[PDB]
Amino acid sequence: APSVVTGVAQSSPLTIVTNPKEPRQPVPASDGADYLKTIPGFAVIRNGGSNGDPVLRGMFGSRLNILTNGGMMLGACPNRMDAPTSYISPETYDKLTVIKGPQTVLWGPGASAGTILFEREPERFGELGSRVNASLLAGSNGRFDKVLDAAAGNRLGYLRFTGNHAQSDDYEDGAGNTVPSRWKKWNGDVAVGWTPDEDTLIELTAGKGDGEARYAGRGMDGSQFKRESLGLRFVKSNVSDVLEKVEAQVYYNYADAIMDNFRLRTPDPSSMMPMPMASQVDRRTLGGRLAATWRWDDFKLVTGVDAMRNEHRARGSKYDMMTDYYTDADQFPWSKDAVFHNYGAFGELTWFAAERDRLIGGLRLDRASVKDYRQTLANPTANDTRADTLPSGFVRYEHDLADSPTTLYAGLGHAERFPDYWELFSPKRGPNGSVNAFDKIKPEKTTQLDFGLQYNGDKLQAWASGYVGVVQDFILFSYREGMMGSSTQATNVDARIMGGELGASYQLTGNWKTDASLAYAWGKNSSDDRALPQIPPLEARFGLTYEEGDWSAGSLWRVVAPQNRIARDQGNVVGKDFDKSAGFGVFSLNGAYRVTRNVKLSAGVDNLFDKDYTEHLNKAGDAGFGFSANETVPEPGRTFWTKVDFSF
Ligand SMILES: [Cu+2]
């Protein structure tokens, strides 16, 4: 029976696995963050119509470790207008995996909050054959998506093409105002795979993508988000009796971004930027991974190394005051400001004691350097390099109850994250006493305890996952004051965090089903005896479902508490806290019909009751567009969408 997705269970301890090709009930804006909105734990900062910044249990930014096909794609805007999830079209992947908390060491450094894994799976052709999947979505406000996934091959290897094109106009809020929010996005990507015998795979991949998006939050819109990307991966299997797998992969991703104030808006003569202005930035990322999995019937061991160089450059437009001329950014040389390296080694080990007891541990050690290539701002850290060695690891114990189909789990984790591009270069001020941020921001050290349970019964599925943690040298942003616009200062503080997520799924009759989910996050700034900023409020979802093995309808109610813990004028590189937030409820409806084996119809109405509201985390709306300099960007009002999936 064909459904429409509205939440995801925790399928295993701390681990959520979904297929991002299923329709989702608050229809996602064709980016990475909106596909995480359905998973309890995740909030999204809103910037406009798309390209939100994702947040997991209140943690922001590089604390989330988002990988696409094992590789890592970093954007270039100093103010994270193109966060790593903005280059992702989840409709083109096949699997989405979320691992909550510092509880894997297999996928790179600094995963304090969690790991997110969008991946393509290799084809499985036997005889000579072909396969086409395609989808079309029309919705309110000029929403149109077009998605294609096609492949061909036999048992010796395959060609696969995936690609999408998606766009929408400005949406409107619960009060009929239109919000600066149009966007456009395309992606094209090729993969060639060689399977010379059943144990061997060599796959080669490349693609490009591009997009634009109007940003209600910011003083500039994204007129270009160019992506060029390349990858190679080698996998052998059954190398020996113990050696079960050897994986090597190299990835190259390149981001090339243009933000300006004149292509998607007109400059605004009251603001700090009253003339046409364009900012061009790029980000070149090269990395790879080598890994061996060993298996001997009571133990599994995975050992590997991984590396990563990333480079960052900028160049602006000019504008002559006495001529009204305007020279563009591409008429000038790129100016490097930062290069980052990381090398790491890792080991993860599982013990299958009995069949109701499981022990997992992992360790990883990291060498992480950054060089500051800025010559001026003169620059007291010009051409300075700095590094650190960061041990990280975790232990998880899982035990199944002999009685019921219940699983309990507890785990302890410790993660050290080196500061990222935004934490060292983007803040105009560093800590009191510092020459700048690059010199003094210390790495972040998180120590967290994760616990929860699973119940998979006949009519009743349920899961919970809680966390408690301290964070030493949490990298906090303080906007505090303005002097020519708002300027930030990065600092290090100690903090306490705690929260959890739970959910439940009950089968009423054979056709009727209802589910629920709750998500909480709490955070204290222990160094200053106040709350942590940018924490989302407690939130709850209720769904009702009718399936008749041919077609289904669904109802959804999202209920969100107010947030009364705020730390005004503090936050991250993207947003600051200003006001306690109002709660709200939003109701939604969906159906689905299987027309034939190949053609599946879906449709929904989002926010049926046209609620006027704003999430706590959304950006502070511009004021060049009519906002009171602090009101946050409003969520869309009533919206309809319809989608056809065909798989011939
Ligand atoms: Cu920008």
Side-chain angles (χ1 to χ4, degrees):
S3 277
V4 159
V5 162
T6 223
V8 201
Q10 204 181 263
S11 91
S12 3
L14 317 155
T15 320
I16 301 100
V17 187
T18 190
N19 155 24
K21 277 203 164 94
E22 310 286 37
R24 279 161 170 65
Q25 157 79 70
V27 78
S30 204
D31 95 320
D34 286 12
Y35 279 82
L36 306 176
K37 270 161 169 208
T38 24
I39 298 182
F42 287 104
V44 179
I45 284 154
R46 186 176 283 274
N47 294 293
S50 198
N51 302 341
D53 223 326
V55 159
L56 179 66
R57 309 168 161 180
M59 315 287 122
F60 171 87
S62 289
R63 291 149 185 126
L64 278 73
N65 178 28
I66 294 130
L67 312 167
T68 60
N69 280 324
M72 163 169 85
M73 163 113 204
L74 310 158
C77 165
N79 301 122
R80 281 186 63 101
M81 276 180 326
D82 62 337
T85 28
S86 75
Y87 296 88
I88 306 174
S89 223
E91 316 222 30
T92 62
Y93 288 84
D94 295 316
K95 195 137 102 89
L96 169 57
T97 282
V98 182
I99 297 164
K100 302 201 256 212
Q103 289 268 336
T104 197
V105 293
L106 296 194
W107 302 111
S112 38
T115 299
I116 316 193
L117 303 187
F118 296 90
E119 52 192 51
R120 259 152 231 135
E121 273 151 348
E123 314 281 331
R124 305 249 154 282
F125 283 125
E127 307 282 336
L128 188 59
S130 200
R131 163 208 120 195
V132 190
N133 294 62
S135 63
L136 296 156
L137 175 115
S140 312
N141 302 114
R143 179 81 198 252
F144 183 87
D145 289 16
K146 172 205 310 191
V147 173
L148 182 46
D149 192 338
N154 67 7
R155 66 189 95 255
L156 261 40
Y158 56 80
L159 174 72
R160 178 191 190 165
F161 166 80
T162 68
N164 78 319
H165 183 297
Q167 45 160 117
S168 153
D169 305 330
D170 295 319
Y171 74 74
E172 319 188 319
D173 53 23
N177 314 132
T178 75
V179 180
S181 64
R182 74 195 230 39
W183 53 271
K184 198 189 269 135
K185 275 181 196 258
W186 60 269
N187 287 297
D189 280 271
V190 182
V192 173
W194 183 18
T195 46
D197 60 54
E198 257 187 349
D199 288 0
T200 320
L201 176 56
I202 308 100
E203 183 191 74
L204 186 269
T205 83
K208 32 191 50 163
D210 202 356
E212 60 192 17
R214 181 131 77 210
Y215 282 128
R218 329 280 183 119
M220 264 188 182
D221 322 273
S223 61
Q224 195 194 284
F225 293 114
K226 262 302 323 168
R227 183 189 103 244
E228 194 230 325
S229 95
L230 275 174
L232 216 177
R233 73 185 263 256
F234 193 170
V235 168
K236 260 268 199 194
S237 306
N238 304 83
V239 183
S240 88
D241 199 23
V242 318
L243 205 28
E244 181 186 23
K245 200 164 92 149
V246 179
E247 289 188 281
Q249 69 187 287
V250 177
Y251 59 87
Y252 167 89
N253 303 315
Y254 171 64
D256 177 12
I258 296 163
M259 53 223 41
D260 60 52
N261 76 346
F262 67 81
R263 284 188 237 249
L264 259 155
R265 53 173 89 179
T266 88
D268 173 300
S270 311
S271 52
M272 282 326 143
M273 29 205 6
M275 61 297 198
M277 203 158 343
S279 200
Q280 185 154 30
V281 282
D282 67 357
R283 195 96 190 247
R284 218 180 297 278
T285 291
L286 177 70
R289 208 164 148 285
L290 185 24
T293 293
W294 325 75
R295 185 70 154 94
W296 59 117
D297 249 16
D298 254 16
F299 312 83
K300 166 198 233 207
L301 176 58
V302 184
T303 46
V305 285
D306 60 45
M308 188 265 315
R309 184 161 194 145
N310 69 75
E311 182 182 305
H312 184 262
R313 311 178 296 169
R315 56 175 188 195
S317 86
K318 263 277 180 54
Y319 213 68
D320 196 311
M321 266 314 216
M322 310 296 223
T323 312
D324 263 309
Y325 177 44
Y326 186 82
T327 318
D328 210 0
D330 60 346
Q331 296 295 107
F332 289 86
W334 299 107
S335 182
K336 238 197 279 212
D337 65 347
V339 167
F340 276 89
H341 284 88
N342 189 80
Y343 318 83
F346 56 91
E348 215 178 86
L349 153 70
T350 301
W351 176 26
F352 307 97
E355 32 192 279
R356 299 192 280 109
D357 285 288
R358 253 170 325 278
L359 201 62
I360 300 99
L363 300 171
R364 70 178 284 128
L365 191 65
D366 279 282
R367 173 65 180 191
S369 37
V370 60
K371 188 169 171 201
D372 172 6
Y373 284 89
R374 300 165 305 177
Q375 311 301 117
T376 68
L377 275 174
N379 178 34
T381 39
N383 318 276
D384 274 357
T385 310
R386 63 170 272 204
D388 212 349
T389 305
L390 298 189
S392 280
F394 78 99
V395 78
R396 186 163 71 253
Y397 174 50
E398 302 171 3
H399 167 81
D400 306 340
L401 281 181
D403 179 12
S404 37
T406 299
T407 281
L408 309 169
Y409 68 91
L412 188 102
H414 181 81
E416 324 208 322
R417 187 179 55 81
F418 198 62
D420 62 25
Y421 172 83
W422 304 272
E423 297 171 315
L424 301 165
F425 289 83
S426 308
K428 171 155 151 253
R429 270 189 319 291
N432 308 286
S434 42
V435 269
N436 66 16
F438 181 92
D439 219 39
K440 326 264 182 117
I441 289 305
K442 307 159 129 217
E444 189 186 83
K445 324 243 201 151
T446 315
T447 306
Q448 159 153 323
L449 178 103
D450 269 89
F451 58 96
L453 60 70
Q454 317 255 340
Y455 178 77
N456 173 100
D458 201 354
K459 312 300 245 158
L460 172 67
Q461 292 94 302
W463 57 273
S465 195
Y467 68 95
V468 180
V470 292
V471 172
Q472 150 202 327
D473 290 318
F474 184 86
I475 316 182
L476 189 73
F477 276 74
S478 296
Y479 293 68
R480 246 145 64 266
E481 273 219 34
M483 26 177 304
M484 41 210 186
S486 111
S487 83
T488 33
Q489 162 193 61
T491 58
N492 280 127
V493 300
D494 289 2
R496 297 224 323 117
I497 58 154
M498 73 167 69
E501 309 92 26
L502 52 154
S505 224
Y506 193 38
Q507 197 87 36
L508 298 174
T509 93
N511 320 277
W512 281 106
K513 189 196 36 72
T514 176
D515 46 7
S517 86
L518 213 86
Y520 191 53
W522 185 95
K524 183 202 198 136
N525 181 340
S526 287
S527 306
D528 290 323
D529 204 358
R530 52 169 68 120
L532 266 201
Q534 309 272 274
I535 317 293
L538 160 68
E539 138 169 28
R541 303 199 158 99
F542 308 96
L544 189 77
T545 274
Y546 184 84
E547 326 191 349
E548 206 172 87
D550 204 21
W551 70 282
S552 64
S555 95
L556 160 74
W557 231 312
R558 179 163 175 258
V559 160
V560 166
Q563 169 65 258
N564 278 1
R565 312 178 46 89
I566 53 138
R568 181 170 294 206
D569 292 329
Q570 310 206 300
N572 52 64
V573 53
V574 162
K576 70 189 193 148
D577 273 11
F578 207 68
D579 273 315
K580 321 208 204 210
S581 79
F584 53 82
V586 174
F587 176 82
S588 323
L589 201 91
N590 60 91
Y593 175 60
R594 202 162 277 135
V595 171
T596 86
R597 296 61 212 156
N598 309 357
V599 196
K600 171 216 283 195
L601 274 178
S602 342
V605 45
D606 294 352
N607 196 4
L608 185 51
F609 307 124
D610 189 61
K611 179 90 201 224
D612 187 7
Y613 72 120
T614 196
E615 311 258 6
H616 177 29
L617 277 179
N618 299 6
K619 256 289 306 217
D622 185 297
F625 287 132
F627 294 100
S628 131
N630 275 132
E631 33 168 343
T632 43
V633 153
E635 288 290 286
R638 174 149 34 84
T639 286
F640 297 89
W641 59 259
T642 187
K643 174 180 236 216
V644 41
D645 289 315
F646 42 113
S647 149
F648 78 121

